[PDB]
Amino acid sequence: VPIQKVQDDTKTLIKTIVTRINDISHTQSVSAKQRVTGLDFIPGLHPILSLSKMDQTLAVYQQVLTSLPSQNVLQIANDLENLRDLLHLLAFSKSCSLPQTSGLQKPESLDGVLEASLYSTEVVALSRLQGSLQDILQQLD
Amino acid sequence: DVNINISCETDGYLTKMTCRWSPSTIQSLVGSTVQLRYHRRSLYCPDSPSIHPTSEPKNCVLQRDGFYECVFQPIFLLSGYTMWIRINHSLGSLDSPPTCVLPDSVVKPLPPSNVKAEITVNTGLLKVSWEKPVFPENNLQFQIRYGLSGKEIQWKTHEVFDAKSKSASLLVSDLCAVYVVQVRCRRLDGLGYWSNWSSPAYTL
Amino acid sequence: VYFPPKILTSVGSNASFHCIYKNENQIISSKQIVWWRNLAEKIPEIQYSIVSDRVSKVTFSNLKATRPRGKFTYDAVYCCNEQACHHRYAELYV
Ligand SMILES: *[C@@H]1O[C@H](CO)[C@@H](O)[C@H](O)[C@H]1NC(C)=O
Ligand SMILES: *[C@@H]1O[C@H](CO)[C@@H](O)[C@H](O)[C@H]1NC(C)=O
């Protein structure tokens, strides 16, 4: 498939998933000036530049999103998985042959917060994931 | 020979897939159980469709109008589906010629709410405006129809191409009376389907 | 460390909470704490009180029926240090 069609599809995917996060987060409105400890393994506090960082961060986001038991969250997770596959397609498109290595998650704290802090985990994960997606959209061009 | 046309339908929320197909050439097989097989792909529909050796079944229900009905949940925005009709019986097995459908190519939106109109008595063009639905985010083209008010309506048709245009201007014949207008929207490229019409908004 | 973690009361009466914040091996004082609701609204300083050096007390007034938010049917209130909120919270039910 041509690369340009792929890029347009990626951009549309980011825009649609951001919109879903937005209208599902309107009832879960949060303020950025509130930091909650115990979620240091949720990313979003640093800018994202390199491809592998995006891949690993999106994998972590997918993991925490499927760690939550709700249908809409399942849909978000499925869309992020499709986004990750699209990003891998782009990475291979760039004609860089660094061997693919993925994984490396030891999320015991994830289970702890899920059994203790369902609501906070959900809202913080959604907010930081939306911020991350905005950063990727900013740096894609 | 055997042939089954396939039609699919997608709601505007991008959370439901509906597909429908006609049973018009299976009634003549006594004892023929029906069933459906669908195979998913990583990305995109391929060039030449074919039968995937590994598949997944999915039951379908019979409605009153005479069409088999079944759905998929949850759905994938950019994943290809390869599905077909299969018939099993006691003298072998026949497979139908399949058809590939992209989920994003059969999406229709909701009608556009908050349709209004007014007559600019100064100039003479009818002014109407709408708001695009939240989904899909892709650019859309709108078609407009107007007419008089009464039992029977002799409509007139017109369209607006520029997706960014939330306003329109239209040459008219009478202005002291009351007109009727509605709108509908669809994707610019051509994929998907028309989305009904809009609620009747009466002019003043 | 909350007491009580939840409460039940219909529309038409006040509310009462009590929290103590634990951080690592240090317990913060009370004069610095600020309350929070649903991580969306900050409560003006008129609505607090201090019983002793180690507890933050808040008394709400003319509570209104809560609005459902997804599958959830309760509103959460958090006691936080500066801008650092602990994971646990109290449950508000009307
Ligand atoms: C028109 O709208 C109604 C309800 O808004 C819906 O049930 C119907 O399916 C729509 N028409 C088409 C062709 O989808
Ligand atoms: C609630 O607070 C009001 C003043 O804010 C007070 O008058 C009343 O006695 C309190 N208790 C109730 C309403 O049960």
Author numbering:
A (entry chain C): 1 to 141
B (entry chain B): 427 to 630
C (entry chain A): 332 to 425
What did the published study say regarding this structure?
Leptin is an adipocyte-derived protein hormone that promotes satiety and energy homeostasis by activating the leptin receptor (LepR)–STAT3 signaling axis in a subset of hypothalamic neurons. Activation of LepR in turn drives the phosphorylation and activation of the transcription factor Signal Transducer and Activator of Transcription 3 (STAT3), which drives production of anorexigenic peptides that suppress food intake and increase energy expenditure. LepR is a member of the class 1 cytokine receptor family which includes the related receptors glycoprotein 130 (gp130) and LIF receptor (LIFR). The structure reveals an asymmetric architecture in which a single leptin induces LepR dimerization via two distinct receptor-binding sites.
Focused refinement of the LepRD3-D7-zip complex centered on the leptin–LepR interface yielded an additional 3.8 Å resolution map comprising leptin together with the three interacting domains of LepR (D3 and D4/D5), enabling molecular analysis of the site 2 and site 3 binding interfaces. At the high affinity site 2, the A and C helices of leptin engage several loops in the CHR2 (D4 and D5) of LepR, burying 750 Å2 of surface area. The interaction appears to be mediated in large part by hydrophobic contacts, such as between Leu13 and Leu86 of leptin and Leu503 and Leu504 of LepR. Moreover, leptin residues Arg20 and Gln75, which were previously reported to be required for LepR binding, form apparent hydrogen bonds with Thr441 in LepR. At the low affinity site 3 interface, the Ig domain of LepR (D3) engages the top of helix D and the CD loop of leptin, burying 775 Å2. The primary contact appears to be mediated by Tyr119 within the CD loop of leptin, which inserts into an aromatic cluster consisting of mouse LepR residues Phe403, Tyr405, Tyr409, and Tyr420 (“site 3a,” Fig. 3e, f). Immediately adjacent to Tyr119, leptin residue Ser120 forms apparent hydrogen bonds with both the hydroxyl of Tyr409 and the backbone carbonyl of His418, which is also contacted by the neighboring leptin residue Ser117. Comparison of the previously reported apo-leptin structure with the LepR-bound structure reported here reveals a substantial rearrangement of leptin helix E as well as loops AB and CD loops. This results in large part from a second site 3 contact site formed between the leptin AB loop and the LepR Ig domain via a primarily backbone-mediated β-sheet interaction formed between LepR residues 415–417 and leptin residues 35–37 (“site 3b”). Notably, Asn82 of leptin lies in near the center of the site 2 interface and makes key hydrogen bonds contacts with LepR residues Ser505 and Leu503, suggesting a loss of site 2 binding associated with the N82K mutation.
